[PDB]
Amino acid sequence: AVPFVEDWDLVQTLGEGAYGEVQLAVNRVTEEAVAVKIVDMKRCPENIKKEICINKMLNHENVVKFYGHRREGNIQYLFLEYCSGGELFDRIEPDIGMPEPDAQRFFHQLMAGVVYLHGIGITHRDIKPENLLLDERDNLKISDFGLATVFRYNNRERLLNKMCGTLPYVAPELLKRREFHAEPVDVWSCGIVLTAMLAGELPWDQPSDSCQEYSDWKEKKTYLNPWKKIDSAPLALLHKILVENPSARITIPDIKKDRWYNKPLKKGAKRP
Ligand SMILES: NCC1CCN(Cc2ccc3[nH]c(-c4cc5ccccc5[nH]c4=O)cc3c2)CC1
């Protein structure tokens, strides 16, 4: 009933992805802020249709909320949660990382989001710092479900075979096997994200035997560049996550039992 409540103004550009751009939209009356993903279909009906479907199913504090979508010819307008904190990528100092306590807390939030997604049967398939957003209170939110898919339906898991994601964050089995379990792949990418937060660098371009960096990790040369600056406890967790055999790689339930995962490190927000 209130007059101009449905009008939104596009204040600025949050980031222009490969397929389009994302803008910060402010409500004309209430001044509520939201992000609008703008994609030009004439450049894909199938992809965007799936992304919208998966987003409608999501409702969790560590997953970017989906408010709705507006047709408007061939310019899909996806209204999503606005995270003023930006990308986790920008909170990682090159070659340094960030304070261990912050990384632990961001890792906890990441696991909560992934447990939720996997619990509802969907795999993200492209977990990386650029898709992990921070809200005003620094709470992590998993975003961009353009590459996500359902791996469990009617309590029956389906193996994946499509190759997608981002090389540095991709699990080795995706490059070596024809079919693979969805869950271990997201676990692996979360491991590369943790390494990034603690070392401020990616360990390898891709998890292939041909990649020298990857071979050195499998040979346990932890005295080398990335691993040397991490620290015992979290390093032990990484050894369990970045395991080549996906069937031997640690699961999320066990990650929540890991020593570093449960180590008291960070206090609450200064002055409650
Ligand atoms: N003065 C203009 C600059 C432009 C770059 N900007 C960094 C920055 C701050 C907040 C910020 N929030 C985003 C978002 C992206 C995004 C992508 C996909 C789904 C939902 C959302 N929601 C967002 O919320 C991206 C981004 C990026 C700092 C201000």
Tab-separated table of C-alpha atoms and ligand atoms in Angstrom, residues 12-14 22 35 64 80-84 86 133, ligand 1:
chain	number	residue	atom	x	y	z
A	12	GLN	CA	27.261	1.787	-7.667
A	13	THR	CA	28.950	-1.286	-9.080
A	14	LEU	CA	29.995	-3.951	-6.581
A	22	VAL	CA	26.621	-6.705	-9.818
A	35	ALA	CA	22.844	-6.412	-4.416
A	64	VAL	CA	23.851	-15.273	0.570
A	80	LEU	CA	20.469	-10.893	-3.547
A	81	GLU	CA	21.758	-10.115	-0.063
A	82	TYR	CA	24.068	-7.122	0.232
A	83	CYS	CA	27.307	-7.793	2.114
A	84	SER	CA	29.008	-4.472	2.917
A	86	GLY	CA	33.046	-7.280	0.467
A	133	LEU	CA	31.478	-12.464	1.207
B	1	LIG	N1	33.529	2.737	-4.316
B	1	LIG	C1	33.243	1.551	-5.151
B	1	LIG	C2	34.072	0.347	-4.630
B	1	LIG	C3	33.758	-0.931	-5.434
B	1	LIG	C4	34.483	-2.124	-4.808
B	1	LIG	N2	34.008	-2.267	-3.402
B	1	LIG	C5	34.428	-3.491	-2.679
B	1	LIG	C6	33.184	-4.251	-2.288
B	1	LIG	C7	32.414	-3.895	-1.080
B	1	LIG	C8	31.159	-4.612	-0.824
B	1	LIG	C9	30.741	-5.634	-1.772
B	1	LIG	N3	29.606	-6.425	-1.756
B	1	LIG	C10	29.605	-7.249	-2.898
B	1	LIG	C11	28.555	-8.244	-3.266
B	1	LIG	C12	28.699	-9.087	-4.312
B	1	LIG	C13	27.690	-10.112	-4.564
B	1	LIG	C14	27.922	-11.072	-5.624
B	1	LIG	C15	26.938	-12.133	-5.789
B	1	LIG	C16	25.781	-12.235	-4.905
B	1	LIG	C17	25.533	-11.247	-3.871
B	1	LIG	C18	26.511	-10.198	-3.722
B	1	LIG	N4	26.380	-9.302	-2.700
B	1	LIG	C19	27.307	-8.351	-2.440
B	1	LIG	O1	27.173	-7.543	-1.527
B	1	LIG	C20	30.803	-6.996	-3.608
B	1	LIG	C21	31.512	-5.973	-2.963
B	1	LIG	C22	32.749	-5.280	-3.225
B	1	LIG	C23	34.455	-1.099	-2.619
B	1	LIG	C24	33.724	0.116	-3.168
